[PDB]
Amino acid sequence: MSPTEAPKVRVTLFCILVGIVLAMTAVVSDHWAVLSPHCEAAHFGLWRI
Amino acid sequence: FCLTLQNPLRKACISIVEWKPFETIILLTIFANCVALAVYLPMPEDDNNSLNLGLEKLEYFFLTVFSIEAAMKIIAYGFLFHQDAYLRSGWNVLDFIIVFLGVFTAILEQVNVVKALRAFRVLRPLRLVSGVPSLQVVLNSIFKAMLPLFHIALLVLFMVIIYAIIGLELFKGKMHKTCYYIGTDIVATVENEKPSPCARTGSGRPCTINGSECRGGWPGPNHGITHFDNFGFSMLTVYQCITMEGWTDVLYWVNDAIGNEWPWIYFVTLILLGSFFILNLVLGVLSGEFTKEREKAKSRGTFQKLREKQQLEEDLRGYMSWITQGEVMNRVFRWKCHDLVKSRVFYWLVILIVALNTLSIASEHHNQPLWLTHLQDIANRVLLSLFTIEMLLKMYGLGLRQYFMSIFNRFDCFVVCSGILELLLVESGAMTPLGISVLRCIRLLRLFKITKYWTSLSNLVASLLNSIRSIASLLLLLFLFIIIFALLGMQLFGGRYDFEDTEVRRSNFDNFPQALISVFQVLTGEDWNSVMYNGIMAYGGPSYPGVLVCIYFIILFVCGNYILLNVFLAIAVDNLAEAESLTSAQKAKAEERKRRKMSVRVLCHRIVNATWFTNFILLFILLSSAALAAEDPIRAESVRNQILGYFDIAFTSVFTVEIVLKMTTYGYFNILDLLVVAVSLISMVVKILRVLRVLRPLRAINRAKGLKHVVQCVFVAIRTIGNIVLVTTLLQFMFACIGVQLFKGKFFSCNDLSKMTEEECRGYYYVYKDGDPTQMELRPRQWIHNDFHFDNVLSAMMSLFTVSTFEGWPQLLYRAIDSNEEDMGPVYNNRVEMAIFFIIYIILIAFFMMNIFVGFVIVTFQEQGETEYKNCELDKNQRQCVQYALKARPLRCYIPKNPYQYQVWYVVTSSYFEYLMFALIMLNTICLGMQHYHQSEEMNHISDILNVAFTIIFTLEMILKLLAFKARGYFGDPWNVFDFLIVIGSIIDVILSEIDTFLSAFFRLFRVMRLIKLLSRAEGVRTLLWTFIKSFQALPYVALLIVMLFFIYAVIGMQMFGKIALVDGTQINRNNNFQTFPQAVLLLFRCATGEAWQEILLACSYGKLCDPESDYAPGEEYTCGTNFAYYYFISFYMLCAFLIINLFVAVIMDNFDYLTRDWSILGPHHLDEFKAIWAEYDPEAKGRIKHLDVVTLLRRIQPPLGFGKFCPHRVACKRLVGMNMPLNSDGTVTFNATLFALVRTALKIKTEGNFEQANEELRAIIKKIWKRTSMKLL
Amino acid sequence: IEYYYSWSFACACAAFVLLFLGGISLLLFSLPRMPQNPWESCMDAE
Ligand SMILES: COc1ccc([C@@H]2Sc3ccccc3N(CCN(C)C)C(=O)[C@@H]2OC(C)=O)cc1
Ligand SMILES: [Ca+2]
Ligand SMILES: [Ca+2]
Known part of the structure; x- marks a missing residue:
């Protein structure tokens, strides 16, 4: 009860439940390398490039 | 002094001759020997002078006397069981070991007709202390306080080891690259830079010397002493950082290697943990050990000796005036000069x-x-x-x-x-x-x-002078400790600094005066690493025989700073206790004298009364501040500084709304919250109003109920303390004025040291780089004045403050010893007698006058622990102990069922398994200490095999410890929760390593952190860590002033000193700066440990050149910095020091019970063992046990609580019954009052009838009802 | 040739910054407390 009904453990657990998808954002997004030769820009990810 | 196996006196007469001066004619002989070692002048490479050739004969003369007399004590006794007896006393074992090894080096040096056996010759001033038995009770007052500090020293040793294997695995082999001139082996630097590591295309510092390249053939950063690339040099360089002399050189040499952002967490965590936190434990055990002995000097007889003889003296001086004022009374003229004097005219x-x-x-x-x-x-x-x-x-x-x-x-x-x-x-x-x-x-x-004119410390200046047969019996025995180490390093290092460099190593061991000065400097801690590096390069180098020189300066620094804590702290504790109790007895003597002569509004309150509103202000204070934190110093036009500049008007919407709303209901602290917005609105000289914007945190200590309480307890502790701080600043002022008579005008010096005066110090001259007489370069010579100098009373107090701290005092000692005449440059070793000024000043101020500040605080915060008086029937220990017996709660241990599962369980929790896993952890550490640099490949593979081989074993202790407790009981004990954490990350160490080779550093650290499970067994250490970590969490507010004080001083520092350019060669460089907020805080930390803070202070004072990414009217490059730096840095050193010994003393006075526990009589360590055996009968709690168990339960207890070592048929058949107990049913007896009943037999023996009056002392000494007295009265 | 990010780096170096920081907070909130007093023990009944 007292470890599992407290507001500090249920605020925390929902904040876990937010960023569980933020990685799942990154697992299918391919955006955090922006090449710029100048066109020949590339967009790298974890699967798609 | 008899025989019993005696031989007639003819040969026993000798015993008669041993009478009164016989001991003192050979105690006079040995002071002649100590001078005979102190004039030996060590000379390099087997050279001599006439006086050392007439002293080696003298050694022979001295040796014979000791031998004749150490033969006439075994036969002034007699036979083999009479030299058996003489030896029996351990003071005469050293007297024999010296003189037998004395003649051994007269033989072997005369056979080879060696020089490491000439250094047992230095041990003879200890033979001097066996002669005076007055000092044998003084050494035994230093050795007697070392058995409590055992569990601290073991904790320093599992941190010097832990940070070594961490620092091996991360830092091994990184610092081997330096900038080299193209195609040479010549290392490239700037004039005032020591050579450092660099990286090529990484994050380290790129070489920028012009015509310079970075290559890796470089041995190490201090000639190869301080690196991390095997276990001995990782442990020598971590030990250096703990003693806090030059930890910021090891930190900055890693930032020029691997990179800038990650390695700060290693050096800061380590320093605090092993330095600011070990030093909290050392000043708690030692502080409590000196208090438990004044209680045992209260309890023998010694209180009256300083009370009676005090009051026998002041009554003697008063009885003299009742005769001598009538020896005189001869005119009116002789009286009117008596009315003159005692009047306030x-x-x-x-x-x-x-x-x-x-x-x-x-x-x-x-x-x-x-x-x-x-x-x-x-x-x-x-x-x-x-x-x-x-x-x-x-x-x-x-x-x-x-x-x-x-x-x-x-x-x-x-x-x-x-x-x-x-x-x-x-x-x-x-x-x-x-x-x-x-x-x-x-x-x-x-x-x-x-x-x-003081008349406020003359109960201490009185109490001082009563102890000067005891003050001086310690300052002698410190002074004897130097003279062994002064003379041991004249052997090992005399001569021996025969380097062919053109640099000066002035803290050397050539003479006896110089050796003495050197030994003392290493005790003040200042720059001892340089004195050690020279002793390693004096021998081979970083090699196998050369580096065992390093354990001279470890025994010197540890065991010499141990004597300093047994003297200054003790004197200030014992001498302070008397100066306070006698003043508090002049309290009770005086108030018994003075009694003889006398005999719409209503919505708004709710709106700002609600909790959410109060918290809504706080996250706009916690955000108003952190926008000053992220502000850019160097650009007033940044897109960041604009978008953070909008928050100056975006936060002063809300703090404008509330101040109008506040002043409807109403109409000291309140005016500042108007004053913050006032500056924040007028700022919408322009520069000098930004500084007053810093007080946005200070309106957060009007909101917390806890933050008001600490700042008021600090202002209490200045009204107390501010009598000592004023007397020091008088005594600081005297030594400042001697220094203007000695050193005035003398600290000018030219640029080359050949030109003695200013008229000659013009034109240009040559400097030679590395002392090659072929590699020379012009420089203009210029007559430079010293930085810290003695030239008026003001600058003489500026210089003295730095010396008092211990920073940079050797560069003032040598600028003073080399001092010539009035307006004239220096002269090498001119006045070597002016090392006594800087030693008398240090012994007075920095070790003693300052020891009364901590002693005073420690004592007058036991008065906050003594203005609360609880004189009930029960003694505090009884009462505290009693509190234990009421408020307890039993444990859970989860003993299993299903005897398959039980068959594992007994095998696991047995001690031949606990030995087994606490051997494998001890073997697993030794495999990690095996790693090193330029190792072979046959170590590379058995490294990685045992990384897998151990990981399987600690996995298999964890599968078993799931089976026995079945999961619910495994995650109940929080070492097992940590043990689960280690097993997982150790597996990821294996899998992530192999999948790269099949086709990071952080998971290598789960191999080292498994050592912390040694703390799960050390009940003596795990209690000591618990008791001091309990009370940093219990004082989270005093540790938030220090958080706040670094916040304020960084932001002011980023403001004024933020535009200094990063030249390298100075103290504002790419490692030390105020150009961000993390850089600034780190810089502040360097100064709070005192690295070169006076050398930082000179580096940010107006003259310094600004970076070009700032703007300025050109022609004003040399304009930034300000002479506010003196106010900034001196105020910071005095506030932070005050606020740290504040937090140091407040942690001692929660553990004042543990620190003075007196382990013999009764404590919770006995009372833990109740609940241990109470776990044996209740697996899960469920209240009670059976009555037949209490028969067998009670023999399980140690006789300091339970029953004796006798057969319990006589007492236990009575004490279980004839002493009262609560009577529950045939198979029930409760937990808590069973525990109450068995301590009541030990302590607080009360007869029959006091079953309600013992509940009266258990209800008036008690706090909240806690109505379980129905199960706790009878 | 540069490196730049406006989506993934600041989400994954937020998801790291989330998950590492919340689980540690979740860890501290179910371990009992520092016992503060000589009778308490981690793992004590209820
Ligand atoms: C700013 O950080 C500090 C450090 C030290 C102190 C005081 S006085 C002092 C002054 C100058 C240099 C060292 C000290 N030392 C160093 C001597 N000890 C190793 C024996 C102290 O121990 C004192 O602290 C205590 C509780 O003993 C206060 C603030
Ligand atoms: Ca220092
Ligand atoms: Ca220093």
Whole structure:
């Protein structure tokens, strides 16, 4: 009860439940390398490039 | 002193001769031997002079005497069981080991007709202490306080090991690259840079020396002493960082290697943990050990000795006045000078001519005006008369018998005589070329007359002088400890600094005066690493025989700073206890004297009364501040500084709304919250108003109820402390004024040391790089004045403060010893006797006068622990102990069922398994210490195999410890929760390593953190860590002033000092700076440990050049920095030091029970073992046990609580019944009052009838009801 | 040739910054407390 009904453990657990998808954002997004030769820009990810 | 197996006296007569001076003719002989080692002059490469050739004969003479007499004590006794007896006393085991190994080196040195056996010769000043038995109780007062510090020293050793294997695995082999001139082996630097590691295309510092390249053939950063690339040099360089001399050189050499952002967390965590936190434990155990002994000196007889003889002295001095005031009373003229003196006309107008004497003295300066020179001989001739008037008035108008009786009038007749000594000597033509200024140093005694005006520490200055057969019995035994180490390093290092470099190593071991100075410097801690690096390069180098020299300076620094804590702390504790109790007894003596002579509004309150609103202000204070934190110093035009500049108007919407809303309901702290917005609105000189914007955190200590309480307890602790702080600043001021008579004008020096005066120090000259006489370069020479100097009273106090701290005092010692004459450059070892100024100043201030500040605080916060008085029937321990018995709660241990599962369970929790896993952890550490640099491949593979081989084993202790407890019980014990954490991350160490080779550093650290499971067994250490970590969490507010004080001082520092350019070679470089907020905080940390903070202070004072990414009107590059730096840095060193010993003392006074526990009588460590055996009968809690168990439960208890070592048929059949207990059912007896009943037999023996009055002392000494007294009364 | 990010780096170096920081907070909130007093023990009944 007292470890599992407290507001500090249920605020925390929902904040876990937010960023569980933020990685799942990154697992299918391919955006955090922006090449710029100048066109020949590339967009790298974890699967798609 | 008899035989029992004796031989007739003919040979036993010798025993008669041993009478009174026989001991002292050989105690006089050994002081001649100590001088015979102190004039031996060590010379390099087997060279000699005449006096060392007539001393080696003398050694032979000395040896024979010891031998003859150490033969005439075994046969002044007699036979083999009479030399058996003489030896029996351990003081005569050293007296034999010296003189037998003494003749051994007279033989073997005469056979080879060696020089490491000439260094047992230095052990003979200890044979001096066996002779005086007065000091054998003084060593045994230092050795007796070392068995409590055992569990601290073991904790330093599992942190010097942990940070070594962490620092091996991360930092191994990184620091081997330096900038080298193209195609040479010559290392490239700037003039004032020590050579550091660099990286090519990484995050380290790129080489930028012009025509320089970065290559890796470089051995290490201090010639190869301080690196991390095997276990001995990782452990030597971590130990250096703990003692806090030069940890910021190891930190900055890693930032030029691997990178800038990650390695700070290693050095900061380590420093705090092993330095600021071990030093908390050392000053708790030691502080409590010196308090438990004053209670056992209270409890023998010793209180009356300093009370009776005190009051037998003040009644003796008072009984002398009842005769000697009638020995005199002869005119009206002899009386009206008595009404004159005791009136306040005289005691408020002799203080007028003292202040004319200070101002006469504190106006000397170098190059002073000719009128103020001529004035000061007039004002000396006047103030010599006005002291002589009030002495002739005092020696006749109130008699010469009251005069001599006083302790302070004895000073005055001297000062009048020794003042008129000068006016008769200098008015002679007998000027005596040096004594014309020695007698100017003499008239400096006149400002010691103002010490009489205190009358607030004369219960301590009284209490000081009662102990000067004991003060000096310790300052001798410290002074003997130096003279062994002074002379041991004349052996090992005398000569031996015969390097062919053109640099100076002035802290060397050539003479005896110099060796002594060197030993002392390593005790003050300052720059001892340089004195150690020279001792390693004096031998081979970083090799196998050369580096065992490093354990001279470990025994020197550890065991010498151990004596300093057993003396200064003890003196300030024992001497402070008497100076306080006697003043608190002059309390009770005086108030018993004084009693003899007498005998719409309403919505708004709710709106700002709601909790959400209060918290809504706080996250706009926690955000208003953190926008000053992210602000850009260097650009007033940044897109960040604009978008953070909008928050100046975006946060002053809300803090404008509330202040209007606040002043409807109403109409000290409140005006500042108006004043914050006031600056924040007018700022929408422009620069000087940004500084007053810093007080946005200070309106957060009006909101918390806890933050008001700490700042008020601090302002209490200045009104107390501010008597000592003013006396020091008087004594600081005296030594400042001697220094203007000695060192005034003398710290000028040219640029090359050949030119002695200013007229010659013009034009250009050559410097030679690395001492090659072929590699030379012009420089202009210039007559430079020293930075910290003694030239008026103001700069002489500036210099003294730094020395008091211990920073940079050797560069003032050598600028003073080398000092020549009036306006003239230095001379090598000119005045080697002016090392006594800087040692008397340090012994006074930095080790003693300062020891009274901590001693005073420690004692007067046991008064906050003694203004609360609880004189009930129960003693505090009983009561505290009793509190235990009420508020307990039993444990859970989860003993299993299903005897398959049980068959594992007994095998696991047995001690032949606990030995098994606590051997494998001990073997797993040794495999990690095996790693090193340029290892072979056959170690590379058995490294990685055992990384897998151990990981499987600690996995298999964890699968078993799931089976026995079945999961619910495994995650109940929080070492197992940590053990689960280690097993997982150790597996990821294996899998992530192999999948790269099949086709990061952080998971290598789960191999080292498994060592922390040693803490799960050390009940003596895990209690000591728990008790001090319990109380950093219990004081989270005092540790938020220090958080707040670094926040304020960084933001002001980023403001004013933020535009200094990063030249490298100075103290504002790419490692030390105020250009961000993390850079600034780190810089502040360097100064709070005191690395080169006085050398930082000079580096940010107006003259410094600004970076070009700032803007400025050109022609003003050399304009940034300010002379506010002196106010900034001196104030920061005094506030942070105050706020840290604040937090140090507050943690001691929660553990004041543990630290003084007196382990014998009764404690919770006995009372833990109740609940341990109570776990054996209740697996899960469920209240009670059966009655038949209590028969067998009670023999399980140690006789300091339970039953004795006898067979329990006699007492336990009675004490279980004949002592009262709660009577539950046939198979029930409760937990808590069973525990209450068994301590009641041990302590608080009460007879029958007091079952309700013992609940009256358990309800008036008690707090909240806690109504379980129904199960706790009878 | 540069490196730049406006989506993934600041989400994954937020998801790291989330998950590492919340689980540690979740860890501290179910371990009991520092016992503060000589009778308490981690793992004590209820
Ligand atoms: C700013 O951080 C500090 C450090 C030290 C102190 C004081 S006085 C002092 C002054 C100058 C240099 C060292 C000290 N030392 C170093 C001596 N000890 C190793 C024996 C102390 O131990 C004192 O602290 C205590 C509780 O003992 C106060 C603030
Ligand atoms: Ca230092
Ligand atoms: Ca230093």
